[PDB]
């Protein structure tokens, strides 16, 4: 929040133009999927790559 002040030389001024209270927001959301997918033949894959590590 932020506020501003007034400048007057008098003190019994209980009735005047006061401030206001406004509340803000900051919204966070989700994004799209980060997807990598492969299609293959498991025999040619496992010729030399077991467990696909």
């Amino acid at each position: 929040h932020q506020f501003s002040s007034l400048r007057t030389p008098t003190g019994d001024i209980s009735g005047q133009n006061k401030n206001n209270l406004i509340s803000g927001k900051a919204t966070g959301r989700v994004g799209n999927y980060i997807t990598v997918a492969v299609e293959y033949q498991q025999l040619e894959e496992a010729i030399k790559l077991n467990q696909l590590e």
Binding site: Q41, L43, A46, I47, K48
Partner: protein
């Protein structure tokens, strides 16, 4: 080869009979054609056959078992 096979398939059109010498020559040339075309396969390992500790399957080869047919 092609000509002799065509001859054997076409003699019946003119209603004739091939001779034994013609049959033998056609057989010899057809055998030559088979000799040219012949290829024999090799039986790969089953796929659950262990590779053995002597092939260094820990470091040199990533397979503990043979891949099998592709």
């Amino acid at each position: 080869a092609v000509g002799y096979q065509l001859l054997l398939r076409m003699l019946s059109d003119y209603s004739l009979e091939p001779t034994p010498q013609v049959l033998s020559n056609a057989q010899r040339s057809y055998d030559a054609l088979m000799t040219d075309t012949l290829v024999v396969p090799s039986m790969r390992r089953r796929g659950d056959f262990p590779v053995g500790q002597g092939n260094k399957y820990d470091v040199f080869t990533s397979d503990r078992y043979y891949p099998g047919d592709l």
